[PDB]
Structures are given as C-alpha cells and as structure tokens.
Amino acid sequence: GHWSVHAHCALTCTPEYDPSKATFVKVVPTPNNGSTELVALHRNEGEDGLEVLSFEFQKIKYSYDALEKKQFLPVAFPVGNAFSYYQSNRGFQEDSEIRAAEKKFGSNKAEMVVPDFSELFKERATAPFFVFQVFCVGLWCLDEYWYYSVFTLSMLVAFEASLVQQQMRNMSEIRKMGNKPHMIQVYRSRKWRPIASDEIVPGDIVSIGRSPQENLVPCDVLLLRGRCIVDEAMLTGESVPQMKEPIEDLSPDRVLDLQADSRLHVIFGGTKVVQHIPPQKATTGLKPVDSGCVAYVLRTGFNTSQGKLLRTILFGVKRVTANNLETFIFILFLLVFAIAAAAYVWIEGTKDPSRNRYKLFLECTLILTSVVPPELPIELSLAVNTSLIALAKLYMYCTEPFRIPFAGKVEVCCFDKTGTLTSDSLVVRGVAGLRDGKEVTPVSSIPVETHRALASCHSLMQLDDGTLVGDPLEKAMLTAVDWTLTKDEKVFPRSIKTQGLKIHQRFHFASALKRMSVLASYEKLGSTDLCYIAAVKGAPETLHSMFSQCPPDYHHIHTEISREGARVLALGYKELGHLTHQQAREVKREALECSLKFVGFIVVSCPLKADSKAVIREIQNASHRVVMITGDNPLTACHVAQELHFIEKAHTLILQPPSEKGRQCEWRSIDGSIVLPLARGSPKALALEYALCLTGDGLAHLQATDPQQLLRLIPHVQVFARVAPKQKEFVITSLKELGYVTLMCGDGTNDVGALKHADVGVALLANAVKLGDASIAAPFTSKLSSIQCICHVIKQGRCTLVTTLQMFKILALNALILAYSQSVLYLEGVKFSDFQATLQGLLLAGCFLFISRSKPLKTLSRERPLPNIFNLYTILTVMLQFFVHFLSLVYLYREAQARSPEKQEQFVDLYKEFEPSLVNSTVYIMAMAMQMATFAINYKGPPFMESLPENKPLVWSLAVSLLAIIGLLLGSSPDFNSQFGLVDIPVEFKLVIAQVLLLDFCLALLADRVLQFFLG
C-alpha cells in the first residue's frame, strides 16, 4: 500500500530535485513510525525578501533553513529563548503583527481528523493481503468453483469490515476524549480580548483561571505570576495535585529546563483548573480583567505533551501489525510443500497429452492459492482481540495491543514498594528522637517546637470546598498534628492555646537537593513584631550535616529506626532570629538550610499489603525472578523484601561506595558481620551464598568507574534502592539489554520514564480515573490498586501465546492435508463438487472460530509456554503428523483405485460436466477424518489452558464433524449422500476404511504424545 502510493505520485508529476521550486516533496517515514506521504509545498511572499518553502506532515511543520543549516528542520518554538528574557518580555503590542505572526509561524488546532468508515475501508483495501486474497478468489472463479469463491470472498470482506468497525468504535472514543474549542481571555495589543482556544499561538500571554464551566486547559502555558491549584489528574494522574509557583520570584540567571522544572512552574495542557490565587495588587505587572493567573504559552499544536501522545496514538498504527518473520517463514514452508505438490501435479498431467494444458495450469494455480490459507492473519487478529476483550473485564485498559503477546515471554518482573507494594495512606505511629533511647514517644508528649515544626512543614492545599488534599505522608502527619489548615495558608491548632502560623511562601521538594523548606513568620507573644521561623524536612542523611547541634546517636537511632522498616524522616527547625518583610523575599531557597537545629525524627510505618504475599509467592512459583526497584532506605527495602520473601538467603550484603577515592568497593551485610570487597570474578558464587542489593549512589559510582562489572552484576541483584527516576530507566534498560523480557509495575510520577521503555509495563492509579502520564502511553493501564493485575496479565499473555502456537500448528496441518489431497486427487480426475468442499470450508471456518475463543485456567503453573513457533517441537510434530496422515491417504487411494472399474471410453465429451464417482467419496471422507484428527490431537490442554471438554463450542463442533463423517461413511440416508453426490461403497470395505481411519488416528495420537513426553 505505502509503496503503491509513490508510483501514483510519480505518474501525476515528476519528482523534482532542484531546490529552486519543487512542486512536491516526498516524506520519509523513518522506521520508528509513520507512513510514506507526499505534501505540496507552500509558497509565501517575504516581507524582508526571504522566502521559505513549508510543508505539514502529521500536522507537524518543518522548514528548510536556507540560511544556516541548508536542510529541513522543524519550526523553532519560543521555549528555547532565555528565561530571564521572558521575565523581561512584555509580549506583542499590535494586532496586525499578531495575524502576521500567526500566519508566519502557523496555528494550532486541537481537533483531530477521524477518517470515514468508507474511507477507512478503502484505505485498508490497499493492503497486500486483501489484494492477494481477492486475486485468489478470482482464480476460484476462473476454475468454475463459483460457490467457493462467493463464500470465501464474503468471509474475507466480512472480517475486514469487522476490523474496520472496531477501528471506528475505537475512533469514537478518541472523539469522546476530544476537547471542544472555547473562548479564552487573552492579552493582545496591550489589551485583553475574548479569544477562542484554536487561535492561540506561542508567544501570546494568557491569563487563565478557574472556569465556571470547568473548561480544560487548552495548551501548555508558563505561569508568569500568582499561585494556582491545578488538578493535573487526566494528564499526570497523581491523586495529589501539584502546586504551581510564580516565576517572578525565580532568579533571572536560571535557565529553564522542561525535565527539571516541569512540576512547579509550567502549566501543562489538557488539565482542569480548580482554584487560582490572585497576586497582590502592590506588585506591578500584567493586569488581567478576569483576575486570573497570567501565563505564557510555550508549546502548541500537537507538539505539546498531550498532543504528542494522542497524535502518536492516532497516526502510529491503524491496527496492530504482526507480519513478523515467523509468519513469513510459515507461509514459506507451507508454500514449499505447495510447490512440491504442484510440481507433481504438472508432471503427472503433462504425462497425459489429451487434457488441456491451460486448464491444468489453472488448477495448479488453484492448488497454490488454496495452500496459503485465506484465514491466516485473520485468526491472529482474532486471538489478539479475544485476549484483549477478556483482559478488559479485569478493569484494566490496554492502549496498545501489540506487546500483549510479549507478556507470555516474561522472565524477570520489576516492582516498586512505594504506593504499589504498600498502601500510600498508611499511618503514623509517633515522633522519634525526642526522648532518651530508641523508644518513640506519642504525638501528645512531643514539645511544642516539634508541634509547630510538623504543622508548618506541609505542602497541603485547601480547595474551594476546603477539603484537605495532598501527600498522604503530609496528610497523615497533619492529622496527627490536628491543626486546622485554612484557605489563607494559616495553620490554627484545634486544642492548643498557641497563635496560628501563616506560611508566607513554600519551597517544595527537589530531587537533587533531597530536601524541602518552609518559610513563615509567627507573631511574638505580647508584641506585634513578626518573628520568622522556618521548618524544613528532607533526607535524614543529607539533613544530618546541616544540623548545627546534633546528638551523637543520630546515625545510630536512624539505623535502628530503619531496622524496623518504618519510613524515617528527620525534622529540623532554625531560630533565624528576627527578619524583616523585604528580607524574606530577599533570601533564596538554598539559604534556609544552613545552620539548622536538630528537632527529631518521625517514624512512618509502611503497612505491607496482605494480598501482596500470595501474588509474590505465585510469581516466584512461576519459574520467574522478581526484582525490587524503589527509592527509600536500602535496609528498609531489605526488610520489605525479606517480608515478601524477595530474598531467601541466610544473609544479604549492602553495597556502599567508599569514602576515600581509589578504594575498592566493599560489601557490608545488614548485620554488618560479613564484609568482602568486590571481586573481578563472577558473583554467581556469592549470589548462591547470599543475596545482593545495590544502592543508587553505588550505582552511579559503578557507572562512572566501569560499566562492565555493573552489567555483570545487575542480573543477580534482587533489591534496588535510593534510585532516582533516571537511574530506574537505567536499570530497566540494562535488564532489557541482557535479553530478559522486562515487566514493571509502577504508580508514582518517578516511574513514568521507566514504564515508557519496559517491554511490558502496567501503571496503577490509586482511588478512582486518573489516567496518568504513563497510563496514556504505558503498554498497559490498571485501575485496581492491587497487584493481582500482574498475575492476571501474565496469565493472559501465556494463554494468548499458547493459542497462537496452537493456531499456527492447526493451520499448517489442515492446509497441508487439504492441499495435498486436492492436488493429487484432481490429478486422478477426482475433484470436489460445490456442495462438499463448501461443507469443508464451513467446517474449517467454524472450528477455527471456536478454537480462537479458548478460555484460560484460574491459576498459573510451573511449566513455561514455548518461546515461539521457532522450536523443534512444532516442526517435528507437524512433519510426523503429516507423514502419518499421508501414508493413510495413499493407502486409501491405492486400495480404492484397485477397485473402481476403468473408463468406458477414452475420449469424454468436453461439454459434459462433473458426474459423481466413488473416489470422490473415499477422498472426502478421509480428508474430513484428517481435519477432525488435527483438531482433536493438537489441542494442548492443561496446565497452560483449560481442558478439552471444557471448551464447549469446540466440543460441539468436533462432535458435529465426527457425526457427519460417520453418517457419510455409513451412507444410511441415500438422500443425504445423493445430495453430496457421493456413490455408495460396499460394506465389506467400509470395514477396511474405518479400520485404517482408526489406525491413523491412534498412531497420530501416540506419536504426538510420545514426542511431547520425550521432548517436554
């Protein structure tokens, strides 16, 4: 189809090479994705005298940089300009130049293109396989087999129309998620205008706000000023809304990076606005009529994140393509036996001079067309569709079907304990470090300084309804604190006679700094002066050095707290003395951390889910390896891992990078008793001796020193800890490079990048639907917080893979039987009339459809599905069965031919049509027996799928086929077999026919089962 396009383009107009004036330019799709297309260039007048030829591909604009690069390049977006310049940037000033800029840089239309069902059918009809099929149908027409042609063409067009219908049903959903265009209050020509969403262009300044109609954010915008409560669920999927901070406070020397500064300052498109905080009237700047937060438009068109993902959804694949090498080699092998049969056909026919040659070549081509089954990719699509529909009932969505089959081949599965293996809600047991010893004191008895430190240090927010929403950790601590949080960022104690604390501004968590700070002031008792007190929290290991005064048992108590597995978080509070109002704005975010005072720890219990234990046990029972990738304390992860039996060795040793440069890395055990430096040899012996786990800092050190030993060590490691999001992508890709099929289950925003690159990925959304950033483009998407989705998806993958193997085997045997039977038996002047091979076509169609709908078991088993069709078992069984059936067929033919009386007249009138015979009867009955035997023998039952009797449709179909075979062989009803035009056989030789049929069936069963037993 794609190659068929360029011939038409060449015919319409010649390709043009000269860059002076090109009428049309071919578009290279690139192997990753896309399709071959031709686009007409756009010629525009240049105001400055410089012309640019432009084209649009997938609604993405690219330009020929005739000035510097002399090549096609995408249009540069205003995001690349300096952050400080945009701070100083005012925006456009006049409307004529506004249309000038809109025309010259293009526009953005969030509406998508939905092809018509007729158009979709026409576009699918160009596929090579449908053309091959319709050619074959025409060949059956030419061989006078008119009924055969009409039935096969009807079935093929019916299935293609069914595919088009399900494609249209999917397109209807994409239409449903489409966002209707709407008016927006935007700043242009030094004024505010009512402007529709479609006509927004980058460089515009828009003051967005909480729309009374709950209108979604049109596109990505950069929050210039003000605070806003934004619900990024439908895009990002975090149940916790992410705060947005104004950039006027940001330093001008900073250079904006999308990856680093995405969460707190740039407002993504497609999100829903809940509440916007208006800036103070004292500040001088952009003044909006609607009193909404002013924002700058960075990215538009489909180059925005939501647009990128949904356009990749649309123009990525119409239907899943599975024309892999295995299918090609299957066709090739069946075609090899086809060519052998056809060669015998031609030779034996040419041995006879009387018969026509052109007709003989016609049935030769008929045999060839019959060999390649017209239903070959149809049932692969059917099996994938049935698997998808079955997997749908488990409340789990699948954005892309194609790596569903990859689920069966999984060997190593990755898990995250944060939020996925443990509930995020949890509970707080107390506040530690405020009393002598390792004992944790209740929240009631902790000092008031700890009370204010815990209460102030929170990023929680208040909605219009005022419901408390935020991080479950902060949620739980404030619940223990019990101080009310008001919409005015004032924290009031419920039962404590202390003045409330008003948070002036919040510094949020940074991954690199591993800390966050809160800056606020409290009124002194008996005076109106404002005393600024700042409470901070973060990584205890980082927070230790920043304490000015610290107890000696800090690391000791931290070690024992992490021993229990409870999440430990150090609390800090600095006096800071008295501060002025302006100086509070003056102080930067990295200055609050210095000269801190220790306040104590907090123990945060992580409750391991009970349902986790059974699924982990089952997945280890599946001859699979499980690896833990998480970010908390490494020995905390060790406690979690041993609790779920992730590690079963006598001891486990942690890896640390050495304090001094040039020192060889040395492991230390959890108890610390066993210490051994890393050896250059294989860690297999140590792994047998004890379990190994890697820390994130050690991971970085091993990356920086030499990747080789790291690559050797990764496969045998069970626990990964303190791993930042980039290094999770690192570890997933590293596991993939070893060749093991990778499965990962993640929920947090840190896991998006890793789930992007995993071979099979599932994303879990709490509560609910959120439909997170990953879940848009994750391989799979699950709505249930439990991780039973892992075992369910693995089971479905096993089932679909075994079904595909089954299907290829059935098609191979059945095609070979029908092909050889027809090929030689037409040579003997014995061809099927319309009714009988119509019947066989119905039996094949019905049996294929019923076996396509197999059901799986309830529990998985230790045995592993075969990797693919390319294994010795399949080829050896197909050949052994084929010879076992071939010998029987040859015996039947010779035994019959030794019996039928010869021709009465050598020359037969050409006008005479088919007249019934007995060889017809024997060959058709034997072929039916062979199809029945194929279906009965090759159905692999437990423990990979249900038993043979359980699949009631297939049992009924096989029973009907066997009843038809037995009734025809008996020939009890003369009307019945007369309708089929089958001549009666003498009973003395139904005896032999039945005996040889049973012998063939039993030999096939015994041979196949003994082969399975020997090569299991």
Look at residues 816, 815, 821, 825 and name the one whose alpha carbon lies nearest to residue 348. 825
Return d(Cα 882, Cα 213) in angstroms, integer.
69
Segments forming the whole domain that contains residue 47: 2-75
User: How many domains are contained in the chain?
Assistant: 6
Return d(Cα 728, Cα 734) in angstroms, integer.
10
Look at residues 615, 693, 617 and name the one whose alpha carbon lies nearest to residue 649. 693
> 632: annotated binding-site residue?
yes
Neighbouring C-beta atoms of residue 189, cutoff 10 Å: 14
Span between the terminal Cα atoms of the chain, in Å: 43
Listed residues 46, 75, 104: the one ending a domain:
75
Q: Is the dihedral of CA 424, 425, 426, 428 positive or negative?
A: positive
Q: What are phi and psi of 255, to 5 degrees?
A: -110, 120
The enclosing H or E element of 24 equals strand 24-27
Q: Which residues are CB-contacts of 398 (< 8 A; sequence separation ≥ 6)?
A: 388, 391, 392, 404, 779, 780, 781
In a domain, 111, yes or no: no
994 with 852, same domain: the answer is yes
Look at residues 312, 327, 125, 450 and name the one whose alpha carbon lies nearest to residue 776. 312
3-state secondary structure of 64: strand
CA 523 to chain centre: 54
In a domain, 677, yes or no: yes
355 with 404, same domain: the answer is no
Look at residues 599, 515, 601, 597 and name the one whose alpha carbon lies nearest to residue 548. 597
- Which residues make beta-bridge pairs with 668? 654, 675
Return d(Cα 726, Cα 892) in angstroms, integer.
68
- Which residues make beta-bridge pairs with 568? 603
737 with 842, same domain: the answer is no
Return d(Cα 888, Cα 1001) in angstroms, integer.
10
Q: Tell me the two tokens of residue 861.
A: 């088993």
In a domain, 87, yes or no: no
Listed residues 605, 628, 656: the one ending a domain:
605
In a domain, 789, yes or no: no
- CA 506-512-514 angle, 5° bins: 60
> 1001: annotated binding-site residue?
no
> 417: annotated binding-site residue?
yes
> Are 110 and 198 in contact, with CB atoms under 8 Å apart?
yes
811 with 954, same domain: the answer is yes
Q: Which residues are CB-contacts of 419 (< 8 A; sequence separation ≥ 6)?
A: 747, 748, 764, 766
Q: For the stretch 835-873, what's the b/e string if a residue is b when 16 or more beta carbons lie within 10 angstroms of its beta carbon?
A: ebbbbbbebbebbbbbbbebebbeebeeeebbebbeeee
Neighbouring C-beta atoms of residue 173, cutoff 10 Å: 9
Lookup result for tokens 């031919």: 897
> Are 456 and 490 in contact, with CB atoms under 8 Å apart?
no
Return d(Cα 411, Cα 625) in angstroms, integer.
6
Cis before 943? omega within 30: yes
354 with 305, same domain: the answer is no
CATH number at residue 247: 2.70.150.10
731 with 851, same domain: the answer is no
Q: How far is CA 959 from CA 713, 714, 933, 997, 1009, in A?
A: 56, 54, 12, 17, 22
193 with 168, same domain: the answer is no
CATH number at residue 557: 3.40.1110.10
State which amino acid sits at residue 745: C
> 749: annotated binding-site residue?
yes
Neighbouring C-beta atoms of residue 910, cutoff 10 Å: 7
In a domain, 788, yes or no: no
In a domain, 285, yes or no: yes
Decide: residue 22, CB within 10 A, 0-12 exposed, 13-18 middle, 19+ buried: middle
Report DSSP state, residue 911: T
Return d(Cα 323, Cα 1) in angstroms, integer.
14
In a domain, 83, yes or no: no
766 with 721, same domain: the answer is yes
The enclosing H or E element of 135 equals helix 128-142
Resolution reached, in Å? 3.9
Q: Tell me the two tokens of residue 998.
A: 């049973």
Looking at the annotation, which residues are catalytic? 416
For helices 952-970 and 987-1014, angle between their N-to-C axes, nearest 10 degrees: 150
> Are 797 and 404 in contact, with CB atoms under 8 Å apart?
yes
Look at residues 914, 884, 887, 916 and name the one whose alpha carbon lies nearest to residue 900. 916
431 with 415, same domain: the answer is no
> Are 6 and 26 in contact, with CB atoms under 8 Å apart?
yes
> 565: annotated binding-site residue?
no
In a domain, 81, yes or no: no
> 471: annotated binding-site residue?
no
3-state secondary structure of 128: helix
State which amino acid sits at residue 466: G
Return d(Cα 537, Cα 516) in angstroms, integer.
6
> Which strands sit side by side in the sheet containing 54-57, from one edge to the other?
54-57, 60-64, 72-74
- Which residues make beta-bridge pairs with 42? 54
Look at residues 101, 151, 152 and name the one whose alpha carbon lies nearest to residue 130. 152
> 65: annotated binding-site residue?
no
831 with 886, same domain: the answer is yes
- CA 509-485-427 angle, 5° bins: 65
Listed residues 56, 75, 94: the one ending a domain:
75
Return d(Cα 497, Cα 866) in angstroms, integer.
71
729 with 800, same domain: the answer is no
Q: Tell me the two tokens of residue 902.
A: 């010869």
CATH number at residue 349: 1.20.1110.10
Q: Which residues are CB-contacts of 666 (< 8 A; sequence separation ≥ 6)?
A: 656, 658, 675, 676, 677, 678
742 with 833, same domain: the answer is no
